[PDB]
Design a protein around this ligand. Sequence first.
Ligand SMILES: *[C@@H]1O[C@H](CO)[C@@H](O[C@@H]2O[C@H](CO)[C@@H](O[C@@H]3O[C@H](CO)[C@@H](O)[C@H](O)[C@@H]3O)[C@H](O)[C@H]2NC(C)=O)[C@H](O)[C@H]1NC(C)=O
Ligand SMILES: *[C@@H]1O[C@H](CO)[C@@H](O[C@@H]2O[C@H](CO)[C@@H](O)[C@H](O)[C@H]2NC(C)=O)[C@H](O)[C@H]1NC(C)=O
Ligand SMILES: *[C@@H]1O[C@H](CO)[C@@H](O[C@@H]2O[C@H](CO)[C@@H](O)[C@H](O)[C@H]2NC(C)=O)[C@H](O)[C@H]1NC(C)=O
Ligand SMILES: *[C@@H]1O[C@H](CO)[C@@H](O[C@@H]2O[C@H](CO)[C@@H](O)[C@H](O)[C@H]2NC(C)=O)[C@H](O)[C@H]1NC(C)=O
Ligand code: LX5
Ligand code: CL
Length: 627
Amino acid sequence: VTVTVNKNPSHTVPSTLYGLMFEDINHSGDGGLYAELLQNRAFQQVTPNTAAALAAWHPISNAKLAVIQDPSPVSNALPNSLQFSVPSGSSGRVGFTNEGFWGIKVDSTWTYKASLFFRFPTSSSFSGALTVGLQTNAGRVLAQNSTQIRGTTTKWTQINLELHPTASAPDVSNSFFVTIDGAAGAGQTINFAMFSLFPPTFKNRPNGLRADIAETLAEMGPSFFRFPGGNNLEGQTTATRWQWNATVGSLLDRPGRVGDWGYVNTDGLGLLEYLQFFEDTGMEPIMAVWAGYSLGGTSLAENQLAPYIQQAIDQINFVIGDPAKSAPAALRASLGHPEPFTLRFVEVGNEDFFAAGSYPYRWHDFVTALQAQFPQIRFIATTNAWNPVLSPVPQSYDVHVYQTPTWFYQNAFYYDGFQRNGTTYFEGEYAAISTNANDLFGTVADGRLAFPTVQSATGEAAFMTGLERNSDIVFAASYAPLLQHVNSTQWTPDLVSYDAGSVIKSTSFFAQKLFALNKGDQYLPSTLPTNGGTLHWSITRASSSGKTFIKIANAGSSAQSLTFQLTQFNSVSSTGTLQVLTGPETASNTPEAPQAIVPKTSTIGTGKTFTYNAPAFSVSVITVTTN
Ligand SMILES: *[C@@H]1O[C@H](CO)[C@@H](O[C@@H]2O[C@H](CO)[C@@H](O[C@@H]3O[C@H](CO)[C@@H](O)[C@H](O)[C@@H]3O)[C@H](O)[C@H]2NC(C)=O)[C@H](O)[C@H]1NC(C)=O
Ligand SMILES: *[C@@H]1O[C@H](CO)[C@@H](O[C@@H]2O[C@H](CO)[C@@H](O)[C@H](O)[C@H]2NC(C)=O)[C@H](O)[C@H]1NC(C)=O
Ligand SMILES: *[C@@H]1O[C@H](CO)[C@@H](O[C@@H]2O[C@H](CO)[C@@H](O)[C@H](O)[C@H]2NC(C)=O)[C@H](O)[C@H]1NC(C)=O
Ligand SMILES: *[C@@H]1O[C@H](CO)[C@@H](O[C@@H]2O[C@H](CO)[C@@H](O)[C@H](O)[C@H]2NC(C)=O)[C@H](O)[C@H]1NC(C)=O
Ligand SMILES: O=S(=O)(O)O[C@H]1C[C@H](O)[C@@H](O)[C@@H]1CO
Ligand SMILES: [Cl-]
């Protein structure tokens, strides 16, 4: 196909076109982006004296453990304590382990920060060393540190010890331990609360993010981060919804909540840690507010919304408020960030097409109140565009689609036929998730993708050339879900996978990176791809440099020649760079082969005419300078 590139831009490419969609799903938060290594670190939201309350915790030797509703809890937010007892006549090391999130990476090049709260609930004459550390589950101690504790310490006391492994573990099958001497400890009971083990964190933020994951997110050059959900915003009930104020301040004061993907969220990854991350990566937030619906199916009645509307105002005030004018803005100042953060976009709820009967009145009351408080914020509706009819008129819709790779390339013209009437669109949740149109949400046996494939990434890439072409109205687009702990998956495929030790960058990750990093501010119209065809492209240009990004998605099984005609330009560079992601249709980056499919960079000859053969199942970026 001959592709003529117009030198006259048709529109400015939004700065926000490519970004991330995040909630705590597949242990993306706890066990993932949040650096905390202990699972169930503070016994949040578990029933005392049950096995499940002890989840991730194990005795060493004849230790007696129970999670108790502590008569004197470490805080109002953390009512549960680990009751540790050493039987009479004990000897040797007695204590307990935390297995982490399906392991703990033990790296001798890292310093770990261990901490816990303890008291003796009954004063004793105990005198001895409390030892914390890392051991292999095979039984080798790799790191240890200790401090002197006394049985007369009946008030909650924090212990803070660094750990230095003598050796890196050969695998992540390692545990955190706490021990005391069994003879010195015989007959003692100690209550513990609020454990923590941190590796070094991204940007050395002290309640921060796991470095390799945070760096992988930053790598993708995202412009925005939509948070905190997603289903995980909504709760199963009103009472279990995400609440901003429960996620800020001291970890002692965060009660956590049962999330919407089968596990407790610590809320250690809380509103301030999110905003701090955005500051660290140059991302701007698309912040969701809860909108009076939870996943059990309960809508708040119109006459129940006011306190939830105020809580949404509170949440936004924490982010952007003048600290002199609201308690939440003063709270942000009190936590060391007096300067407001950036916030231009707020999403009202999540997938309110599931509650399309009540969203009209929920949208109406929330947005009337919020737009009056925050006239410069753009509020994003979550129902199907224009059905139901919303008031006030939404300035933006969040459009979701899970579909087959084929659907993505066949629907690259999704936005071409939309009216340009000041409405902007956020493709806030999309992925090619299955090769089976008849069973998108099914098993891997029935066509579900366990990981993104070259097929899925190339289909998505074709769809993305359509998002870029239509970026006069499409302002934002994010793959979902973003993150996956391979040992705790509720949803596949996911953009970026990991275990306790390492990260797997998907084919779809590389498509997202190639699209986001090679994106100018000018959209250059070109010959239109065939609507329904496998081959798509999108061309943008950096107005400051003339760097021209020709992105090509071949989503089909056949190589396809493109001849680019740039005769309208005064000059084109005599060479360009080519970045290509390709491989076999069903090839995937997996835990076992995490670099099977990676982009390759070369130099190609260019000028006002050049020909490129886009391979079957390829994402290609050709970068030339045009003036
Ligand atoms: C985060 O902030 C929200 C408010 O934005 C706090 O929720 C509010 O908590 C109070 C105290 O529990 C609730 O008041 C209570 O309501 C019941 C039920 O009718 C009443 O029987 C009690 O005497 C009391 O008035 C209030 O309704 C609730 N509001 C909302 C919007 O949920 C929340 O507690 C804060 N979370 C944390 C951990 O600080
Ligand atoms: C045991 O942990 C303690 C507490 O973290 C370590 O002592 C700290 O060492 C760092 C770095 O040298 C200093 O900045 C702190 O001031 C120290 N604090 C105290 C109270 O000493 C100690 O190095 C650790 N020991 C081992 C063997 O890992
Ligand atoms: C912008 O244009 C869209 C089409 O892309 C309009 O959507 C129609 O809106 C009415 C209700 O207001 C619905 O009953 C129709 O079914 C919608 N059409 C389609 C094709 O979805 C939309 O109203 C326009 N918005 C503004 C602000 O003018
Ligand atoms: C977490 O998931 C990883 C990756 O799937 C598991 O490690 C794999 O285990 C399989 C099947 O037992 C092995 O044959 C693979 O070679 C392993 N892959 C890698 C890259 O190591 C790991 O066992 C899981 N952890 C837990 C605790 O279940
Ligand atoms: O029913 S789903 O399609 O899983 O919902 C998707 C959409 C929702 O915003 C998010 O939580 C979830 C996983 O990406
Ligand atoms: Cl398909």
